[PDB]
Amino acid sequence: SPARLLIPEPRAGRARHAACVLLAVCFVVLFLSLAPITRRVCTQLAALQLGVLLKGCCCLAEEIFHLHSRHHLWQVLCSCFPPRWHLALLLVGGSAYLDRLALTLSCLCQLLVLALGLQKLSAVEVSELTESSKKNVAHGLAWSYYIGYLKVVLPRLKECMEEISRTNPMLRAHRDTWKLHILVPLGCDIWDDLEKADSNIQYLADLPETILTRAGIKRRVYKHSLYVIRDKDNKLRPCVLEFASPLQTLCAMSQDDCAAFSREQRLEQARLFYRSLRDILGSSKECAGLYRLIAYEEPAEPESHFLSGLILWHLQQQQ
Amino acid sequence: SSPARLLIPEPRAGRARHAACVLLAVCFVVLFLSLAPITRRVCTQLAALQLGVLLKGCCCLAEEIFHLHSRHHLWQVLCSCFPPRWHLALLLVGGSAYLDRLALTLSCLCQLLVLALGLQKLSAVEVSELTESSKKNVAHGLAWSYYIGYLKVVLPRLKECMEEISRTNPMLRAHRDTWKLHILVPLGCDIWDDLEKADSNIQYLADLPETILTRAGIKRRVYKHSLYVIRDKDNKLRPCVLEFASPLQTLCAMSQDDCAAFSREQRLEQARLFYRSLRDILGSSKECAGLYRLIAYEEPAEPESHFLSGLILWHLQQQQ
Amino acid sequence: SPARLLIPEPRAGRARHAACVLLAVCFVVLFLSLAPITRRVCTQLAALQLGVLLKGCCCLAEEIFHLHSRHHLWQVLCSCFPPRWHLALLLVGGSAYLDRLALTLSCLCQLLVLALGLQKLSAVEVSELTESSKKNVAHGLAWSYYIGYLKVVLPRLKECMEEISRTNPMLRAHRDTWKLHILVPLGCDIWDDLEKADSNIQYLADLPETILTRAGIKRRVYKHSLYVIRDKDNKLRPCVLEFASPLQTLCAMSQDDCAAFSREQRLEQARLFYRSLRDILGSSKECAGLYRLIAYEEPAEPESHFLSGLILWHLQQQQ
Amino acid sequence: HRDTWKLHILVPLGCDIWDDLEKADSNIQYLADLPETILTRAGIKRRVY
């Protein structure tokens, strides 16, 4: 190849072998040239193995607030500690039974280490963490959706709608709700059309063509559909509705055989995508007030007019 | 109310663990009423009871040494033969050894005696729960449904259909000893809807139109089979009848289904079990004595564009 | 063969011969280099034969609630314990006659083991148990029926019924009962037609063909029969009725000589098929409300209008 | 045989019409039926050929 490519390769995880061989060298060194010595070694091992308990207690104290929002209670207890936590309890119990200045000194130094935070992560660990997780798709979907679609279609919406508002008095009446409404259900189902999703949503017409030029032969054409949705006996409300493509991407990726994308992590990915999209849209000066994204979960009781009620609440929020 | 009366067996609530816990609490309370060395005896009894699973794992690995190459290819055999929660049994055995070997000999003798006589067997409740708990065991059901629905109604009426086919064109009268439908069952799940695109040597010879009609769930019989020609080396051509397995499509759709939660390793295992069940069912039949031939293949790692046709040619050559 | 196939073979069950040769080896080892010792061995053997009694007692406590549904009383007692349970009683009686702290310690250990449940099954045993059951066709039949038929014919029902409805006011009046009524008798008899099964069921017409194209020459064409059932002296009710094919499959394989399919467990297989179909249909989003499967058991008294009344009740439930 | 894909109308100058051509002449063999020619009318009336 004319261009000698230099690409990194995944790490073999061979540090375990080096640790094992140096451990064996340590054994062969120590044995040459003793039950109480082994007991002292076990006590010393149990001495620094109680810091995980303090770290878990601190994490539980910090996470009891998010317990309701994330885990709604045994999940909180088992999450704040590694699954191999009872081993430290067994070791500390054995050390206490075998034998308290050393214990309190060890607790104090471990807590001081935790507070000062001098046991941080180097570059290799963070690099391995970034490389290993092949399912952090939410940030990529959020940024891709933003740059590809919203940065190029959102600004040319008020001008595209004012021309219709010139001849249609109904659009002129509802001037405060000329934004684009993004439907992001926390699941992944996407209805083919919003007319059969809810009987209270009526299709009206398609907005005029959006013309973009690319080299003069390639034309990027954008279409938006304008809907009319019926209230109680008050009035009719028009709005522009569409779903989020990254949700469809996640749904199609879950069905893939080589993706190994389950349903429990798909919900987390959708939630993270919604949060990231909100955080990156809220700091944008181009589409400062040209959008409103609505998020919901399908109710357990199959109400026939749940989505319509949510859209009406959102629309009535602008006025 | 309701004209009928149904008492459906809803699944168990798993409340036997609560009974075990309350009886354990009662026993602890009783022991509290009315000492230290008894803990050592309790630990020794626990180790004696725990070495039974170690003996069972040893017997299981001794039995599965033969099937190692067929299924696991050596650490996988050891992992399968023993339960994952086996370290504590070794810890208890080591503690008992350190505390003290006639007692160990008699305890192990009793445990292996129990294992040999086989007097510890699952009751009706345990086997019923195990049968009703496995929600993904579709291999046997799919094999039986395929056999009954399709394989028992069209194969006996196979000589005559190809008889009218030969009446249309008599070129196949020479191949009198290959009048059996060929079933293509890949151990994966890929299915080629258009069989001519799968390989370059597979070409149609006769595909007459036919409408498959089902009236209120009752399927009509199939009166026509699609004839093919397989291009051999530059000497001659060979005609064939090919058909895939619908249960493989069922497995593929189950895997693609969102609510099924059906992985890939389970899919391969179910496909192999379905193939074995179908072969065993067909091999012990009477109507389908010699009017079928099922071809099972695994897709090769190296890409080959003329593999499937060559495999069918090999099957034809061994059929003569 | 171009592709050397590697297919598993059934296990020969030779672990028992390993147990027997270990019996012989242990015997010849112990003999080289003793009535009280044999009595102690018998007592130790009786010590761990008592756990099955506690397992049966806990099972009885947990299953006394399901006794009415599954066993309606001696069957409850016999099912919760292994048939070879009198041997444990004989051993414990012999131990008591030969001889209290040891018995209590053994009982406490057995209860602790049962509560913790550390004596579980490895991969080989579960694989053998999944391979040995050649008759558990309920789940396979349910999944095959679902994927093959219901996921393809159910969605194209409302639109197929609209065209007939627009010209028949009778169909327009009864719009809430346009589902597919699956009949799943817990037995296995399937009537050739519903006309002679019950005198109150009247055939009306066949639904227009559901045409599916495949490769342009293969046409998967579907018929559904529309019936009319005579209620009491009020009116007539139309519905679409059909039986469940897997019940016909079970009936067909019950008669096979090589199947060895008896009748006592055929009822259980049909019941499990009904439960599995219900569970996998209630969690689907495509056929949300396009079905209603009805199950019944034939009464002792051969009433001539038993099934008709059941369908009338199931039809009035929507209204 | 692509050049003879027409429809062959038999118009005997007499008036006898055979029920089928199989027994009319021993050299004519029936093969199969052409796939259905579906014509839709009002959505319920189907003119199928």
Residue in this structure with the two tokens 């046409």, named with its chain if needed? C219
> What counts of helices (H) and strands (E) characterise chain D?
1, 2
Question: Are C200 and C308 a contacting pair, CB within 8 Å?
Answer: yes
Question: In angstroms, rounded to a whole number, what is the distance separating the alpha carbons of residues C135 and C187?
Answer: 17
Task: Give the residue from A95, A84, A86, A89 showing the smallest Cα distance to A39.
Answer: A95
> Is D31 within 8 Å of B211 when comparing Cβ atoms?
no
Residue C193, token pair as written in the block? 């037609």
Residue C202, token pair as written in the block? 């009247």
Task: Give the residue from B277, B263, B31 showing the smallest Cα distance to B151.
Answer: B277
On whether any CB of chain B is under 8 Å from the CB of A259, the answer is no
Q: Residue C311: exposed, middle, or buried by beta-carbon count in 10 A (0-12, 13-18, 19+)?
A: buried
Question: In angstroms, rounded to a whole number, what is the distance separating the alpha carbons of residues B110 and B114?
Answer: 6
Question: In angstroms, rounded to a whole number, what is the distance separating the alpha carbons of residues B239 and B180?
Answer: 11
Task: Give the residue from B4, A48, B157 showing the smallest Cα distance to C306.
Answer: B4
Judged by 3 or more CB pairs under 8 A, whether A touches D is no
Question: In angstroms, rounded to a whole number, what is the distance separating the alpha carbons of residues C140 and C317?
Answer: 31
> What's the angle, vertex CA A16, arms to CA A11 and CA A20, rounded to 5?
150
Q: What share of chain D is helix, strand, coil (3-state, %, to 5)?
A: 10, 15, 75
On whether any CB of chain D is under 8 Å from the CB of B207, the answer is no
Residue A206, token pair as written in the block? 């398609």
Residue A280, token pair as written in the block? 């990156």
Phi, psi (degrees; rounded to nearest 5) at B291? -110, 35
Question: In angstroms, rounded to a whole number, what is the distance separating the alpha carbons of residues A197 and B250?
Answer: 29
Cα-Cα-Cα-Cα dihedral sign, residues C96, C102, C108, C112? negative
Question: In angstroms, rounded to a whole number, what is the distance separating the alpha carbons of residues C22 and C30?
Answer: 12
Instruction: Tally the C-alpha atoms within 13 A of residue A134's C-alpha that lie toward its C-beta.
Output: 6
Question: Are B268 and B252 a contacting pair, CB within 8 Å?
Answer: no
On whether any CB of chain A is under 8 Å from the CB of B255, the answer is yes
> Cβ–Cβ contacts within 10 Å for residue A248, how many?
13
On whether any CB of chain C is under 8 Å from the CB of A299, the answer is no
For A140, A255, C317, the CA distances from A137, given in Å and listed in that order, are 5, 15, 46
Question: In angstroms, rounded to a whole number, what is the distance separating the alpha carbons of residues C188 and C245?
Answer: 10
Rounded to the nearest 10 degrees, the angle between the axes of helix C264-282 and helix C138-145 is 40
On whether any CB of chain C is under 8 Å from the CB of B277, the answer is yes
- The amino acid at C203: Y
Task: Note the resolution in Å, 1 decimal.
Answer: 3.3
**D5-44 residues touching C, CB cutoff 8 A:** 35-36, 38, 43-44
Longest dimension (CA), chain A: 100
> Is C164 within 8 Å of D44 when comparing Cβ atoms?
yes
Question: In angstroms, rounded to a whole number, what is the distance separating the alpha carbons of residues A280 and A298?
Answer: 25
- Residue C183 is inside which H or E element, if any? strand C180-183
On whether any CB of chain D is under 8 Å from the CB of B211, the answer is yes
Rounded to the nearest 10 degrees, the angle between the axes of helix B138-146 and helix C138-145 is 60
Question: Are B144 and B281 a contacting pair, CB within 8 Å?
Answer: yes
- Return all residues near B54 (Cβ < 8 A) that are at least 6 apart: B82, B86, B89, B90, B93
Q: Tell me whether residue D48 is annotated as binding.
A: yes
Question: In angstroms, rounded to a whole number, what is the distance separating the alpha carbons of residues D48 and D38?
Answer: 5
Binding-site residues of B for 2',3'-cGAMP: 145-150, 221-224, 246
Cα-Cα-Cα-Cα dihedral sign, residues A301, A303, A307, A311? negative
Q: Which one of A91, A256, A257 would you mutate to disrupt binding with B, by most B Cβ within 10 Å of its Cβ?
A: A257
> Cβ–Cβ contacts within 10 Å for residue B99, how many?
10
Question: Are A179 and A290 a contacting pair, CB within 8 Å?
Answer: yes
> What's the angle, vertex CA B160, arms to CA B156 and CA B162, rounded to 5?
105
Question: Are B256 and A255 a contacting pair, CB within 8 Å?
Answer: yes
Beta bridge partners of A295: A184
For A27, A107, B74, the CA distances from A20, given in Å and listed in that order, are 10, 29, 22
Rounded to the nearest 10 degrees, the angle between the axes of helix B246-256 and helix C138-145 is 80
Task: Give the residue from B161, B151, B178 showing the smallest Cα distance to B284.
Answer: B151
- The amino acid at C109: C
On whether any CB of chain B is under 8 Å from the CB of A257, the answer is yes
For A138, A191, A250, B179, B265, the CA distances from A256, given in Å and listed in that order, are 17, 20, 10, 40, 14
> Is D43 within 8 Å of C163 when comparing Cβ atoms?
yes
> Which residue on chain C is closest to A298 by alpha carbon?
C285
Task: Give the residue from D17, B314, B292, B136 showing the smallest Cα distance to C144.
Answer: B136
Residues in chain D: 49
- Residue A204 is inside which H or E element, if any? strand A201-206
> Cβ–Cβ contacts within 10 Å for residue B244, how many?
16
Phi, psi (degrees; rounded to nearest 5) at B4? -95, 175
Beta bridge partners of A186: none
Question: In angstroms, rounded to a whole number, what is the distance separating the alpha carbons of residues A308 and A316?
Answer: 12
Residue B250, token pair as written in the block? 């069922």
C-alpha B86 chain-centroid distance: 28
Question: In angstroms, rounded to a whole number, what is the distance separating the alpha carbons of residues C245 and B215?
Answer: 12
Helix (H, G, I), strand (E, B) or coil at A67: helix
Chain A residue numbers with beta carbons less than 8 Å from the beta carbon of B264 are 257, 260
Question: Are C52 and C88 a contacting pair, CB within 8 Å?
Answer: yes
Question: Are B154 and B221 a contacting pair, CB within 8 Å?
Answer: yes
Sheet of C236-243, strands arranged across:
C201-206, C225-230, C236-243, C180-183, C291-294
Residue B25, token pair as written in the block? 């609490």
Which candidate from C61, C148, C283 shows the least CB-CB separation from B259?
C283
Across the B:C interface, residue pairs with CB atoms under 8 Å apart total: 314
> Which chains form contacts with chain A, at 3 or more CB pairs under 8 Å?
B, C
- The amino acid at C270: A
Tell me whether strands D45-48 and D38-41 are parallel, antiparallel or unpaired: antiparallel
> Which residue on chain B is closest to C13 by alpha carbon?
B63
Beta bridge partners of C226: C205, C240
Question: Are C58 and C112 a contacting pair, CB within 8 Å?
Answer: no
On whether any CB of chain B is under 8 Å from the CB of D48, the answer is no
- Residue D39 is inside which H or E element, if any? strand D38-41
Method: cryo-EM
- The amino acid at B66: F
Question: In angstroms, rounded to a whole number, what is the distance separating the alpha carbons of residues C218 and C203?
Answer: 30
On whether any CB of chain A is under 8 Å from the CB of B266, the answer is no
Beta bridge partners of B292: B181
- Return all residues near C109 (Cβ < 8 A) that are at least 6 apart: B42, B45, B46, B49
Question: In angstroms, rounded to a whole number, what is the distance separating the alpha carbons of residues C213 and B212?
Answer: 11
Which candidate from C107, C140, C280 shows the least CB-CB separation from B145?
C140
Residue in this structure with the two tokens 């008699």, named with its chain if needed? B106
Sheet of B227-231, strands arranged across:
B202-206, B227-231, B237-244, B181-186, B292-297
Question: In angstroms, rounded to a whole number, what is the distance separating the alpha carbons of residues B99 and C7?
Answer: 49
Report, in angstroms and rounded to the nearest whole number, the Rg of chain C calculated over CA atoms: 30
Question: In angstroms, rounded to a whole number, what is the distance separating the alpha carbons of residues B63 and C9?
Answer: 13
C-alpha A54 chain-centroid distance: 28
